[model samples]
Target: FMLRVFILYAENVHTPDTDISDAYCSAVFAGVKKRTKVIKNSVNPVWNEGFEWDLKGIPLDQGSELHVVVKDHETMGRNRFLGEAKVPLREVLATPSLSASFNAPLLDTKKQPTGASLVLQVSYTA
Candidate 1:
Protein backbone atom coordinates (compact mmCIF):
# COMPACT_ATOMS: atom_id res chain seq x y z
CA PHE A 1 0.00 0.00 0.00
CA MET A 2 1.07 3.49 -0.82
CA LEU A 3 0.25 6.12 1.75
CA ARG A 4 0.04 9.74 0.74
CA VAL A 5 -0.36 12.90 2.77
CA PHE A 6 -1.32 16.32 1.54
CA ILE A 7 0.04 19.20 3.58
CA LEU A 8 -2.55 21.78 2.65
CA TYR A 9 -1.64 24.79 4.78
CA ALA A 10 -1.40 26.21 8.26
CA GLU A 11 -2.73 29.25 10.10
CA ASN A 12 -1.71 31.20 13.18
CA VAL A 13 1.54 29.26 13.49
CA HIS A 14 3.90 30.98 15.87
CA THR A 15 7.43 30.64 17.02
CA PRO A 16 8.85 31.33 20.48
CA ASP A 17 9.33 34.86 19.30
CA THR A 18 6.15 36.35 17.99
CA ASP A 19 7.98 38.30 15.30
CA ILE A 20 9.28 35.27 13.43
CA SER A 21 6.97 34.00 10.72
CA ASP A 22 9.21 31.61 8.78
CA ALA A 23 7.43 28.26 8.80
CA TYR A 24 7.69 24.77 7.42
CA CYS A 25 6.24 21.33 8.08
CA SER A 26 7.58 17.81 8.27
CA ALA A 27 6.15 14.36 8.83
CA VAL A 28 7.61 11.08 9.97
CA PHE A 29 5.97 7.70 9.52
CA ALA A 30 7.44 4.27 10.12
CA GLY A 31 10.93 5.76 10.17
CA VAL A 32 10.45 7.57 6.85
CA LYS A 33 10.61 11.35 6.97
CA LYS A 34 9.64 14.08 4.54
CA ARG A 35 9.59 17.88 4.66
CA THR A 36 7.86 20.73 2.90
CA LYS A 37 9.25 23.91 1.46
CA VAL A 38 9.78 26.72 3.93
CA ILE A 39 7.53 29.73 3.60
CA LYS A 40 9.02 32.82 5.10
CA ASN A 41 7.76 36.17 6.36
CA SER A 42 4.22 34.95 6.99
CA VAL A 43 2.47 33.26 9.85
CA ASN A 44 0.07 31.57 7.46
CA PRO A 45 1.94 29.27 5.12
CA VAL A 46 0.35 27.53 2.15
CA TRP A 47 2.31 24.37 1.49
CA ASN A 48 -0.09 22.44 -0.77
CA GLU A 49 2.59 19.77 -0.83
CA GLY A 50 2.42 16.00 -0.82
CA PHE A 51 4.52 13.29 0.77
CA GLU A 52 4.37 9.56 -0.06
CA TRP A 53 5.56 6.44 1.68
CA ASP A 54 5.32 2.75 0.89
CA LEU A 55 3.43 0.89 3.56
CA LYS A 56 3.66 -2.50 1.91
CA GLY A 57 5.46 -4.25 4.74
CA ILE A 58 4.55 -1.93 7.57
CA PRO A 59 1.92 -3.16 9.97
CA LEU A 60 -1.07 -0.92 10.58
CA ASP A 61 -2.86 -0.41 13.87
CA GLN A 62 -3.66 2.05 16.58
CA GLY A 63 0.01 1.80 17.49
CA SER A 64 0.97 3.13 14.11
CA GLU A 65 0.85 6.88 13.98
CA LEU A 66 2.12 9.78 11.94
CA HIS A 67 4.26 12.34 13.73
CA VAL A 68 3.86 15.76 12.24
CA VAL A 69 6.09 18.65 13.27
CA VAL A 70 5.84 22.31 12.42
CA LYS A 71 8.88 24.52 12.77
CA ASP A 72 10.17 28.02 12.37
CA HIS A 73 13.40 28.19 10.42
CA GLU A 74 16.16 30.52 11.40
CA THR A 75 18.68 32.01 9.04
CA MET A 76 21.38 32.02 11.66
CA GLY A 77 21.11 28.64 13.28
CA ARG A 78 18.74 25.71 13.93
CA ASN A 79 14.98 25.84 13.70
CA ARG A 80 12.50 26.25 16.51
CA PHE A 81 9.70 23.88 17.40
CA LEU A 82 6.43 25.61 16.70
CA GLY A 83 4.02 22.76 17.29
CA GLU A 84 3.35 19.08 16.64
CA ALA A 85 0.61 16.46 16.47
CA LYS A 86 0.33 12.70 16.51
CA VAL A 87 -2.09 11.36 13.94
CA PRO A 88 -3.31 7.79 14.30
CA LEU A 89 -3.02 5.92 11.05
CA ARG A 90 -5.57 3.30 12.00
CA GLU A 91 -8.23 5.91 12.53
CA VAL A 92 -7.54 7.52 9.20
CA LEU A 93 -7.44 4.15 7.46
CA ALA A 94 -10.71 3.01 9.01
CA THR A 95 -12.63 5.42 6.85
CA PRO A 96 -14.37 3.99 3.78
CA SER A 97 -12.13 5.89 1.40
CA LEU A 98 -9.03 5.41 3.56
CA SER A 99 -8.85 9.19 3.57
CA ALA A 100 -9.66 12.06 5.89
CA SER A 101 -9.18 15.80 6.01
CA PHE A 102 -8.07 17.26 9.29
CA ASN A 103 -7.92 20.80 10.45
CA ALA A 104 -5.95 19.63 13.46
CA PRO A 105 -4.61 21.66 16.30
CA LEU A 106 -0.92 21.63 16.93
CA LEU A 107 0.40 20.66 20.34
CA ASP A 108 3.37 21.60 22.44
CA THR A 109 5.97 19.34 23.98
CA LYS A 110 3.80 18.92 27.05
CA LYS A 111 1.00 17.55 24.84
CA GLN A 112 -1.06 20.67 25.31
CA PRO A 113 -2.86 22.24 22.39
CA THR A 114 -1.24 25.31 20.90
CA GLY A 115 -3.05 28.01 19.02
CA ALA A 116 -1.66 26.87 15.67
CA SER A 117 -3.85 24.93 13.23
CA LEU A 118 -2.69 22.63 10.47
CA VAL A 119 -4.77 21.33 7.58
CA LEU A 120 -3.99 17.96 6.09
CA GLN A 121 -5.48 15.52 3.63
CA VAL A 122 -4.45 11.94 4.34
CA SER A 123 -5.11 9.02 1.99
CA TYR A 124 -3.88 5.65 0.91
CA THR A 125 -4.13 3.54 -2.26
CA ALA A 126 -3.58 -0.07 -3.03
Candidate 2:
Protein backbone atom coordinates (compact mmCIF):
# COMPACT_ATOMS: atom_id res chain seq x y z
CA PHE A 1 0.00 0.00 0.00
CA MET A 2 1.20 3.51 -0.68
CA LEU A 3 -0.38 6.12 1.60
CA ARG A 4 -3.88 7.57 2.10
CA VAL A 5 -6.86 6.26 0.17
CA PHE A 6 -10.60 6.82 0.31
CA ILE A 7 -13.59 4.67 -0.63
CA LEU A 8 -17.26 5.69 -0.38
CA TYR A 9 -19.97 3.08 -0.74
CA ALA A 10 -23.74 3.60 -0.55
CA GLU A 11 -27.04 1.78 -1.03
CA ASN A 12 -29.93 3.28 -3.02
CA VAL A 13 -33.34 2.77 -1.53
CA HIS A 14 -36.82 3.94 -2.46
CA THR A 15 -37.64 4.53 1.21
CA PRO A 16 -37.01 7.76 3.06
CA ASP A 17 -35.50 6.46 6.31
CA THR A 18 -32.89 4.35 4.49
CA ASP A 19 -29.95 6.72 4.40
CA ILE A 20 -26.76 7.98 5.99
CA SER A 21 -24.74 4.76 6.24
CA ASP A 22 -21.60 4.84 8.39
CA ALA A 23 -18.31 2.95 8.09
CA TYR A 24 -15.25 3.12 10.30
CA CYS A 25 -11.81 3.07 8.68
CA SER A 26 -10.26 1.10 11.51
CA ALA A 27 -12.80 -1.67 11.13
CA VAL A 28 -12.07 -1.96 7.43
CA PHE A 29 -8.33 -2.41 8.06
CA ALA A 30 -9.08 -5.24 10.43
CA GLY A 31 -11.28 -6.96 7.87
CA VAL A 32 -8.41 -6.93 5.36
CA LYS A 33 -6.61 -9.28 7.76
CA LYS A 34 -3.23 -7.56 7.57
CA ARG A 35 -0.62 -6.63 10.17
CA THR A 36 -1.98 -4.17 12.69
CA LYS A 37 -0.89 -0.63 11.87
CA VAL A 38 -1.68 2.63 13.57
CA ILE A 39 -3.77 5.04 11.51
CA LYS A 40 -1.92 8.35 11.44
CA ASN A 41 -5.08 10.45 11.41
CA SER A 42 -8.84 10.14 11.04
CA VAL A 43 -11.80 12.50 11.03
CA ASN A 44 -15.21 10.97 11.60
CA PRO A 45 -17.45 12.18 8.76
CA VAL A 46 -21.15 11.85 8.01
CA TRP A 47 -22.87 11.23 4.68
CA ASN A 48 -25.80 13.18 3.33
CA GLU A 49 -29.02 11.28 2.78
CA GLY A 50 -29.47 10.04 -0.82
CA PHE A 51 -26.13 11.52 -1.82
CA GLU A 52 -22.79 9.88 -2.67
CA TRP A 53 -19.43 10.93 -1.28
CA ASP A 54 -16.95 12.18 -3.88
CA LEU A 55 -13.53 10.66 -3.15
CA LYS A 56 -11.49 12.07 -5.94
CA GLY A 57 -7.69 12.53 -5.78
CA ILE A 58 -6.98 10.68 -2.55
CA PRO A 59 -3.29 9.72 -2.82
CA LEU A 60 -3.20 5.97 -3.28
CA ASP A 61 0.20 4.63 -4.30
CA GLN A 62 1.19 1.08 -5.07
CA GLY A 63 -0.01 -1.33 -2.38
CA SER A 64 -2.56 1.24 -1.31
CA GLU A 65 -6.10 -0.07 -0.97
CA LEU A 66 -9.71 1.16 -0.97
CA HIS A 67 -12.29 -1.39 0.08
CA VAL A 68 -15.96 -0.52 0.70
CA VAL A 69 -18.59 -3.00 1.83
CA VAL A 70 -22.31 -2.34 2.30
CA LYS A 71 -24.66 -3.86 4.82
CA ASP A 72 -27.01 -6.73 4.03
CA HIS A 73 -30.36 -5.30 3.04
CA GLU A 74 -33.77 -6.89 2.80
CA THR A 75 -34.47 -5.33 -0.59
CA MET A 76 -30.85 -5.00 -1.62
CA GLY A 77 -28.86 -8.18 -1.79
CA ARG A 78 -25.35 -6.67 -1.64
CA ASN A 79 -23.86 -3.27 -2.13
CA ARG A 80 -22.15 -2.82 -5.46
CA PHE A 81 -18.68 -1.36 -6.03
CA LEU A 82 -18.80 2.18 -7.27
CA GLY A 83 -16.09 4.02 -9.23
CA GLU A 84 -13.21 5.74 -7.37
CA ALA A 85 -11.40 9.00 -8.06
CA LYS A 86 -7.77 9.98 -7.43
CA VAL A 87 -7.31 12.78 -4.91
CA PRO A 88 -4.40 15.02 -3.97
CA LEU A 89 -2.29 14.43 -0.86
CA ARG A 90 -3.52 17.62 0.75
CA GLU A 91 -7.11 16.70 -0.02
CA VAL A 92 -6.62 13.21 1.35
CA LEU A 93 -5.06 14.65 4.51
CA ALA A 94 -7.98 17.00 4.80
CA THR A 95 -10.30 14.02 5.37
CA PRO A 96 -13.31 15.65 3.84
CA SER A 97 -16.54 13.68 3.50
CA LEU A 98 -17.70 13.26 -0.12
CA SER A 99 -21.40 13.05 -0.74
CA ALA A 100 -22.66 10.86 -3.62
CA SER A 101 -25.99 10.05 -5.23
CA PHE A 102 -27.57 6.60 -5.35
CA ASN A 103 -27.41 5.33 -8.94
CA ALA A 104 -26.60 1.67 -9.48
CA PRO A 105 -27.96 -1.71 -10.50
CA LEU A 106 -30.51 -2.55 -7.81
CA LEU A 107 -32.66 -5.59 -7.08
CA ASP A 108 -35.74 -6.33 -9.10
CA THR A 109 -38.18 -5.54 -6.29
CA LYS A 110 -38.42 -2.31 -4.33
CA LYS A 111 -38.56 -2.86 -0.56
CA GLN A 112 -37.83 -0.62 2.37
CA PRO A 113 -34.09 -0.91 3.15
CA THR A 114 -33.37 -0.37 6.80
CA GLY A 115 -30.37 1.71 7.74
CA ALA A 116 -27.23 0.30 6.13
CA SER A 117 -23.56 0.16 7.14
CA LEU A 118 -20.48 0.79 5.03
CA VAL A 119 -16.89 -0.18 5.78
CA LEU A 120 -14.14 1.79 3.98
CA GLN A 121 -10.61 0.35 4.01
CA VAL A 122 -7.52 2.21 2.81
CA SER A 123 -4.11 0.59 3.08
CA TYR A 124 -0.76 2.33 2.65
CA THR A 125 2.71 0.79 2.95
CA ALA A 126 6.09 2.39 3.21
Candidate 3:
Protein backbone atom coordinates (compact mmCIF):
# COMPACT_ATOMS: atom_id res chain seq x y z
CA PHE A 1 0.00 0.00 0.00
CA MET A 2 1.08 3.56 -0.66
CA LEU A 3 -0.02 7.11 -0.07
CA ARG A 4 0.59 9.74 -2.71
CA VAL A 5 0.31 13.49 -2.39
CA PHE A 6 0.68 16.19 -4.98
CA ILE A 7 1.36 19.78 -3.93
CA LEU A 8 -0.13 21.94 -6.62
CA TYR A 9 0.34 25.64 -5.76
CA ALA A 10 -0.16 28.53 -3.39
CA GLU A 11 -2.06 31.63 -4.33
CA ASN A 12 -2.33 35.17 -2.99
CA VAL A 13 0.43 34.70 -0.46
CA HIS A 14 0.81 37.64 1.88
CA THR A 15 4.59 37.83 1.70
CA PRO A 16 6.01 40.96 0.22
CA ASP A 17 6.66 40.97 -3.53
CA THR A 18 10.15 42.38 -2.88
CA ASP A 19 11.04 39.31 -0.82
CA ILE A 20 10.24 37.12 -3.82
CA SER A 21 9.69 33.84 -2.01
CA ASP A 22 11.42 30.79 -3.36
CA ALA A 23 8.93 28.36 -2.04
CA TYR A 24 8.48 24.61 -1.85
CA CYS A 25 6.39 22.14 0.08
CA SER A 26 7.27 19.44 2.56
CA ALA A 27 4.87 16.57 3.11
CA VAL A 28 5.35 14.22 6.01
CA PHE A 29 3.64 10.95 6.85
CA ALA A 30 4.72 8.12 9.11
CA GLY A 31 8.02 9.89 9.74
CA VAL A 32 8.64 10.01 6.00
CA LYS A 33 9.27 13.50 4.64
CA LYS A 34 9.27 14.55 1.01
CA ARG A 35 9.80 17.95 -0.62
CA THR A 36 8.79 19.61 -3.83
CA LYS A 37 10.97 21.63 -6.19
CA VAL A 38 11.40 25.32 -5.43
CA ILE A 39 9.52 27.89 -7.40
CA LYS A 40 11.16 31.28 -7.48
CA ASN A 41 10.15 34.91 -7.47
CA SER A 42 6.45 34.58 -6.99
CA VAL A 43 3.94 34.54 -4.19
CA ASN A 44 1.64 32.52 -6.40
CA PRO A 45 3.70 29.56 -7.50
CA VAL A 46 2.77 26.23 -9.04
CA TRP A 47 4.64 23.06 -8.23
CA ASN A 48 2.60 20.12 -9.49
CA GLU A 49 5.00 17.99 -7.48
CA GLY A 50 4.13 14.51 -6.25
CA PHE A 51 5.40 12.33 -3.43
CA GLU A 52 4.73 8.75 -2.29
CA TRP A 53 5.34 6.66 0.80
CA ASP A 54 4.98 3.02 1.72
CA LEU A 55 1.87 2.31 3.76
CA LYS A 56 3.33 -0.52 5.84
CA GLY A 57 -0.09 -1.46 7.16
CA ILE A 58 -0.76 1.91 8.65
CA PRO A 59 -4.46 2.50 8.38
CA LEU A 60 -5.73 5.74 6.92
CA ASP A 61 -8.20 7.28 9.35
CA GLN A 62 -9.28 10.51 10.92
CA GLY A 63 -6.48 9.98 13.42
CA SER A 64 -3.92 9.73 10.63
CA GLU A 65 -2.37 13.09 9.83
CA LEU A 66 -0.37 14.22 6.86
CA HIS A 67 1.71 17.27 7.75
CA VAL A 68 2.21 19.66 4.90
CA VAL A 69 4.31 22.80 5.13
CA VAL A 70 5.37 25.53 2.75
CA LYS A 71 8.56 27.48 3.38
CA ASP A 72 10.57 30.22 1.76
CA HIS A 73 14.08 29.20 0.65
CA GLU A 74 17.00 31.26 1.88
CA THR A 75 20.63 30.79 1.01
CA MET A 76 22.10 32.33 4.16
CA GLY A 77 19.75 32.38 7.12
CA ARG A 78 17.48 29.51 8.12
CA ASN A 79 14.53 28.93 5.84
CA ARG A 80 11.75 31.42 6.48
CA PHE A 81 8.55 30.02 7.87
CA LEU A 82 5.64 30.53 5.57
CA GLY A 83 2.69 28.31 6.49
CA GLU A 84 1.45 24.75 7.10
CA ALA A 85 -1.63 22.57 6.94
CA LYS A 86 -2.67 19.06 7.90
CA VAL A 87 -4.82 16.52 6.13
CA PRO A 88 -6.74 13.59 7.55
CA LEU A 89 -7.10 10.58 5.27
CA ARG A 90 -10.30 9.02 6.56
CA GLU A 91 -12.43 9.38 3.44
CA VAL A 92 -10.10 7.44 1.16
CA LEU A 93 -9.40 4.57 3.50
CA ALA A 94 -11.61 2.04 1.78
CA THR A 95 -10.74 2.87 -1.80
CA PRO A 96 -7.96 1.06 -3.63
CA SER A 97 -6.98 4.30 -5.30
CA LEU A 98 -8.50 7.70 -4.95
CA SER A 99 -7.87 11.28 -6.06
CA ALA A 100 -9.14 14.55 -4.71
CA SER A 101 -8.42 18.25 -4.66
CA PHE A 102 -8.62 20.41 -1.57
CA ASN A 103 -7.54 23.77 -0.28
CA ALA A 104 -5.97 24.64 3.04
CA PRO A 105 -5.44 28.04 4.59
CA LEU A 106 -1.89 29.12 5.30
CA LEU A 107 -0.78 30.02 8.81
CA ASP A 108 2.07 32.05 10.20
CA THR A 109 4.34 31.48 13.20
CA LYS A 110 1.83 33.20 15.44
CA LYS A 111 -0.66 30.65 14.11
CA GLN A 112 -2.84 33.31 12.55
CA PRO A 113 -4.31 32.81 9.11
CA THR A 114 -2.15 34.33 6.35
CA GLY A 115 -5.09 34.58 3.97
CA ALA A 116 -3.24 32.36 1.52
CA SER A 117 -4.35 28.91 0.49
CA LEU A 118 -2.51 25.87 -0.76
CA VAL A 119 -4.06 23.69 -3.40
CA LEU A 120 -3.36 19.99 -3.16
CA GLN A 121 -4.09 16.77 -4.99
CA VAL A 122 -3.97 13.54 -3.04
CA SER A 123 -4.13 9.85 -3.93
CA TYR A 124 -3.99 6.50 -2.22
CA THR A 125 -3.07 3.09 -3.65
CA ALA A 126 -3.48 -0.33 -2.18
In terms of lDDT, the best-performing candidate is 1
Query: lDDT score of model 2?
Result: 0.28
Candidate that would win on TM-score: 1
lDDT per model vs. reference: 0.84, 0.28, 0.77
Stretches > 4 Å off in candidate 3: 16-18, 75-77, 94-97
lDDT of 1: 0.84
The CA root-mean-square deviation of candidate 3, after full C-alpha superposition on the true structure, stands at: 2.4
Tell me the lDDT of model 1 at 105. 96
What is the Å distance of residue 96 in model 1 from its true position? 2.0
Cα lDDT tens digits, model 3, 80-105, are 66788877676556455565567989
Sort order, lDDT high to low: 1, 3, 2
Candidate 1 residues 8-49, lDDT tens each?
999998777568688889899868889999998888899999
What is the TM-score (0 to 1) of candidate 1? Answer: 0.90
TM-score of every candidate: 0.90, 0.22, 0.85
Per-structure clash totals for the candidates: 0, 18, 0
Model 3 clash pairs are none
In model 1, pairs of residues that clash are none
